[PDB]
Amino acid sequence: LHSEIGRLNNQSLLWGPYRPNIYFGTRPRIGKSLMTGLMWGKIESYTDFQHTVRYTCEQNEGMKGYGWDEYDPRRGGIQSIHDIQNGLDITTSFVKIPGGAHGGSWAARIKGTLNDDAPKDQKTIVVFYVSQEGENSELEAVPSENEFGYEGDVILKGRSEALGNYKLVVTKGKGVIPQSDHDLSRLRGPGQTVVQSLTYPDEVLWQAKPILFQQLKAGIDWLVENKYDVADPPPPWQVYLLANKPGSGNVHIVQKVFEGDFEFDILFSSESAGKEVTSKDLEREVKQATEVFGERFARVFDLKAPFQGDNYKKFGKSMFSNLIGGIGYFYGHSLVDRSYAPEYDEENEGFWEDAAEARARHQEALEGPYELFTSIPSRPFFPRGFLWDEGFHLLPIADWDIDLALEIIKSWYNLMDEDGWIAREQILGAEARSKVPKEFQTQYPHYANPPTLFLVLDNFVERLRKLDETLSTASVDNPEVGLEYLRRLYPLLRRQFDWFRKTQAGDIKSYDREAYSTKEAYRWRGRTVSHCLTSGLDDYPRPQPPHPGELHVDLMSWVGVMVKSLISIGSLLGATEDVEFYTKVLDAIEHNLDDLHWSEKEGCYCDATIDEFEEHKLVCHKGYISLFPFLTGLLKPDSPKLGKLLALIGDESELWSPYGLRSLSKKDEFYGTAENYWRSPVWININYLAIVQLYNIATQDGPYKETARDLYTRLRKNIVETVYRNWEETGFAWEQYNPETGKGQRTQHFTGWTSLVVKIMSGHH
Ligand SMILES: O=[N+]([O-])c1cc(-c2ccnc(N3CCOCC3)n2)ccc1NCCCCCCN1C[C@H](O)[C@@H](O)[C@H](O)[C@H]1CO
């Protein structure tokens, strides 16, 4: 029955607009298969279209905003795009229609409305680009009746082992098609939909922009060769209209030119499903998806006071939809240094210079291929899987669709190598690499990242203890199913736990270090003079200089998170030998957190280092790091150390701003210095952890119940209102928020863990 649920999930989730790196395109969760993408741009001159054309996501002055208004990966959704440069408000509606044996069918409506500013007679070029990778698969444009192109719909017939037979139709559409009175029209037609059918080696099919332009360039060269010149030039939009040449190939370019508003449909009909998809089906299925989205939202994200109003609902729907709508399918090779150079052990003083020298050996090589199905932080800036981010992303996604979350967890765990390592940044394939400078592609098998995916696992476990509708919760509703999923995943969790302890070990025994346990001590590998990227808090201040004797309290706390989850999951699976080992490790971390990391003088946890005199030293920098045992849920509700942490948390002159908790205290010598990334701004992911832990203490007997209740109330409100106020004014989720001004700063479109705000509003943790 677990096998059955699995197959049903695969069939449910196979198709999606799973190319979040581009404004709009679709691909199935198959590495080498059929992909589509949308391009559009105004044309006002003979040279502007290369500059106006839109394809890959960006964010600059020329784009007001864009995002999913509604989205569920099993059903589809609606995206809106506000393009200032091209004076167009665009909507792309995508819908899935289950049926047959190849993952069902789907349809999209693309609608473009000129805004008030655009010339009413604007010409907009629109391209639907279709490619298919695979050795024995085929795709063919059925030729038109007419001489120069298409008066009606464009029909592509294709086949592959993965998809069986299928047809993909690009409908005629509605809107004015400009007509040219030029002599050229006798050879190219007056103006009509055209198709070019081409083949390139499969591995370059993703390069849609270059492939299109090469065809446009061939067209213009033809004009030059055939005496079309500046004495009497055809209009721009006709100069840039491809000569129709439909056929067989692994690339199909479908081009339309419109004057004024336009719309057209794409209908993907899986042959194994019977009757083909129509535009009427599309309109009906779109109406249905919205009603279903609306109903699940009200149930799953029931916003509590004071955020129950419609403004907050719309805010919540926007934040949530952008998060789950960023889900992508990525496929390809990664760049990995598999030298395990000894310099990477970082055992000596000055280790960063040694590590730099090893990296300058450039032993890294491509490996894989790998696939990943994941949500992402940022469509415009880094549309790809990041390990600790995904733990935050799946917290709301799991609420919505636990089976989906587990699907993504499984996807990530399927990347884990033999040692227990998952690269913290997944850059899969040439297309993904294109967005990343080569110096930054290389992953290192000694680099960890927080195991936040365990948090998602923990929520699943408590839920396990206490058709698309049904599928979304199958793995909790059917406890046999849920448990089997854990059984299969459990060894990889255990492997990762072990990997952390082998590779991210700190050094107690080698120094004058007294502690309850001789084993429990941790140090993030990969630190440079100013950074610790692997911890996730890039430039939070750390002992200077970095040192093999460093110990990092955040990392120890993450191991505490892991072992607690392992206790839970081990228990469920009856792994008694494992549970008793975990039990002893937890007990040990509890004591060693105090013995190595507690500062009585400072009233908080500190990282530790080793003196010029070879003695243990605490290095306190009051901020997120300082609160880690509390953020990760390792402290008892009665703990006096907790009470001291609550005092720091609530203290306005340290961490507490009107807009959330500051990453670093205003009193810290490093406040607002250098790049000031994690040295003052308010970050939603860590504020979320604080909020959840305050609420835990607030809903339980203890000395700090009321304090925590008050801090919960205020921090929830502060965080929510800051993110809302910024969304209201700018339309964006931001990466972080200014604690002086409350302004969003760093990157826009960060959905992204900022979207946690929807779960904060929902409450009842
Ligand atoms: O590579 N870019 O395209 C790129 C572009 C821009 C940017 C900004 C404004 N404008 C422009 N313009 C137009 C576009 O191009 C450039 C010019 N660009 C900024 C950054 C990047 N890439 C940096 C990749 C590293 C991201 C780590 C983020 N997080 C760090 C957290 O600290 C960590 O915890 C967490 O896990 C991760 C993940 O969330």
Side-chain angles (χ1 to χ4, degrees), residues 158-160 162-169:
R159 201 200 50 72
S160 71
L163 302 170
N165 288 286
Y166 61 83
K167 95 173 74 210
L168 180 168
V169 175

PDB file of all heavy atoms in Angstrom, residues 158-169, unseen atoms left out:
ATOM      1  N   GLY A 158       4.061  14.320 -30.885  1.00  0.00           N
ATOM      2  CA  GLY A 158       5.304  13.770 -30.380  1.00  0.00           C
ATOM      3  C   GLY A 158       5.117  12.427 -29.678  1.00  0.00           C
ATOM      4  O   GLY A 158       3.989  12.016 -29.382  1.00  0.00           O
ATOM      5  N   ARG A 159       6.255  11.780 -29.395  1.00  0.00           N
ATOM      6  CA  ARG A 159       6.289  10.490 -28.727  1.00  0.00           C
ATOM      7  C   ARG A 159       7.599  10.370 -27.948  1.00  0.00           C
ATOM      8  O   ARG A 159       8.636  10.855 -28.410  1.00  0.00           O
ATOM      9  CB  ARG A 159       6.152   9.372 -29.770  1.00  0.00           C
ATOM     10  CG  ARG A 159       5.680   8.024 -29.231  1.00  0.00           C
ATOM     11  CD  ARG A 159       6.004   6.837 -30.140  1.00  0.00           C
ATOM     12  NE  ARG A 159       7.411   6.880 -30.526  1.00  0.00           N
ATOM     13  CZ  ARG A 159       8.445   6.613 -29.716  1.00  0.00           C
ATOM     14  NH1 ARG A 159       8.241   6.256 -28.455  1.00  0.00           N
ATOM     15  NH2 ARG A 159       9.681   6.712 -30.177  1.00  0.00           N
ATOM     16  N   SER A 160       7.530   9.728 -26.766  1.00  0.00           N
ATOM     17  CA  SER A 160       8.718   9.294 -26.037  1.00  0.00           C
ATOM     18  C   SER A 160       8.361   8.100 -25.147  1.00  0.00           C
ATOM     19  O   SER A 160       7.183   7.927 -24.801  1.00  0.00           O
ATOM     20  CB  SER A 160       9.243  10.439 -25.201  1.00  0.00           C
ATOM     21  OG  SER A 160       8.333  10.665 -24.128  1.00  0.00           O
ATOM     22  N   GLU A 161       9.377   7.328 -24.709  1.00  0.00           N
ATOM     23  CA  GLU A 161       9.135   6.234 -23.765  1.00  0.00           C
ATOM     24  C   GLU A 161       8.472   6.774 -22.495  1.00  0.00           C
ATOM     25  O   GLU A 161       7.571   6.141 -21.941  1.00  0.00           O
ATOM     26  CB  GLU A 161      10.395   5.417 -23.432  1.00  0.00           C
ATOM     27  N   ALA A 162       8.908   7.959 -22.051  1.00  0.00           N
ATOM     28  CA  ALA A 162       8.421   8.542 -20.808  1.00  0.00           C
ATOM     29  C   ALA A 162       6.972   9.033 -20.935  1.00  0.00           C
ATOM     30  O   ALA A 162       6.186   8.875 -20.005  1.00  0.00           O
ATOM     31  CB  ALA A 162       9.358   9.642 -20.377  1.00  0.00           C
ATOM     32  N   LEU A 163       6.601   9.618 -22.084  1.00  0.00           N
ATOM     33  CA  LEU A 163       5.306  10.297 -22.163  1.00  0.00           C
ATOM     34  C   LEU A 163       4.316   9.559 -23.066  1.00  0.00           C
ATOM     35  O   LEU A 163       3.148   9.939 -23.133  1.00  0.00           O
ATOM     36  CB  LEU A 163       5.490  11.748 -22.634  1.00  0.00           C
ATOM     37  CG  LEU A 163       6.404  12.619 -21.767  1.00  0.00           C
ATOM     38  CD1 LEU A 163       6.686  13.940 -22.466  1.00  0.00           C
ATOM     39  CD2 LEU A 163       5.779  12.857 -20.400  1.00  0.00           C
ATOM     40  N   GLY A 164       4.772   8.500 -23.747  1.00  0.00           N
ATOM     41  CA  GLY A 164       3.911   7.828 -24.703  1.00  0.00           C
ATOM     42  C   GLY A 164       3.635   8.786 -25.852  1.00  0.00           C
ATOM     43  O   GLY A 164       4.468   9.656 -26.134  1.00  0.00           O
ATOM     44  N   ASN A 165       2.463   8.635 -26.475  1.00  0.00           N
ATOM     45  CA  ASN A 165       2.055   9.579 -27.501  1.00  0.00           C
ATOM     46  C   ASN A 165       1.456  10.805 -26.821  1.00  0.00           C
ATOM     47  O   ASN A 165       0.904  10.705 -25.721  1.00  0.00           O
ATOM     48  CB  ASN A 165       1.115   8.934 -28.517  1.00  0.00           C
ATOM     49  CG  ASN A 165       1.811   7.949 -29.436  1.00  0.00           C
ATOM     50  OD1 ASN A 165       2.554   8.328 -30.343  1.00  0.00           O
ATOM     51  ND2 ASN A 165       1.555   6.674 -29.216  1.00  0.00           N
ATOM     52  N   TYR A 166       1.617  11.969 -27.457  1.00  0.00           N
ATOM     53  CA  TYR A 166       0.984  13.179 -26.943  1.00  0.00           C
ATOM     54  C   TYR A 166       0.882  14.181 -28.082  1.00  0.00           C
ATOM     55  O   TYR A 166       1.612  14.085 -29.074  1.00  0.00           O
ATOM     56  CB  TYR A 166       1.747  13.792 -25.759  1.00  0.00           C
ATOM     57  CG  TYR A 166       3.155  14.196 -26.121  1.00  0.00           C
ATOM     58  CD1 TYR A 166       3.402  15.407 -26.734  1.00  0.00           C
ATOM     59  CD2 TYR A 166       4.230  13.347 -25.910  1.00  0.00           C
ATOM     60  CE1 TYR A 166       4.680  15.784 -27.105  1.00  0.00           C
ATOM     61  CE2 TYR A 166       5.513  13.704 -26.291  1.00  0.00           C
ATOM     62  CZ  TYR A 166       5.743  14.929 -26.886  1.00  0.00           C
ATOM     63  OH  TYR A 166       6.998  15.305 -27.279  1.00  0.00           O
ATOM     64  N   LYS A 167      -0.048  15.119 -27.918  1.00  0.00           N
ATOM     65  CA  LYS A 167      -0.114  16.278 -28.787  1.00  0.00           C
ATOM     66  C   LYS A 167      -0.073  17.535 -27.920  1.00  0.00           C
ATOM     67  O   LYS A 167      -0.614  17.570 -26.808  1.00  0.00           O
ATOM     68  CB  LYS A 167      -1.239  16.152 -29.832  1.00  0.00           C
ATOM     69  CG  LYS A 167      -2.597  16.782 -29.522  1.00  0.00           C
ATOM     70  CD  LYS A 167      -3.596  16.751 -30.700  1.00  0.00           C
ATOM     71  CE  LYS A 167      -4.188  15.376 -30.978  1.00  0.00           C
ATOM     72  NZ  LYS A 167      -4.544  15.132 -32.403  1.00  0.00           N
ATOM     73  N   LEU A 168       0.631  18.544 -28.437  1.00  0.00           N
ATOM     74  CA  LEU A 168       0.746  19.833 -27.782  1.00  0.00           C
ATOM     75  C   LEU A 168       0.267  20.862 -28.800  1.00  0.00           C
ATOM     76  O   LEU A 168       0.810  20.946 -29.904  1.00  0.00           O
ATOM     77  CB  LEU A 168       2.208  20.048 -27.343  1.00  0.00           C
ATOM     78  CG  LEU A 168       2.540  21.365 -26.623  1.00  0.00           C
ATOM     79  CD1 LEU A 168       3.934  21.317 -26.003  1.00  0.00           C
ATOM     80  CD2 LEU A 168       2.481  22.528 -27.600  1.00  0.00           C
ATOM     81  N   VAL A 169      -0.782  21.603 -28.429  1.00  0.00           N
ATOM     82  CA  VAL A 169      -1.375  22.564 -29.342  1.00  0.00           C
ATOM     83  C   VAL A 169      -1.144  23.992 -28.850  1.00  0.00           C
ATOM     84  O   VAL A 169      -1.403  24.300 -27.688  1.00  0.00           O
ATOM     85  CB  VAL A 169      -2.879  22.282 -29.518  1.00  0.00           C
ATOM     86  CG1 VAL A 169      -3.555  23.354 -30.369  1.00  0.00           C
ATOM     87  CG2 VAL A 169      -3.125  20.894 -30.095  1.00  0.00           C
TER      88      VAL A 169
END
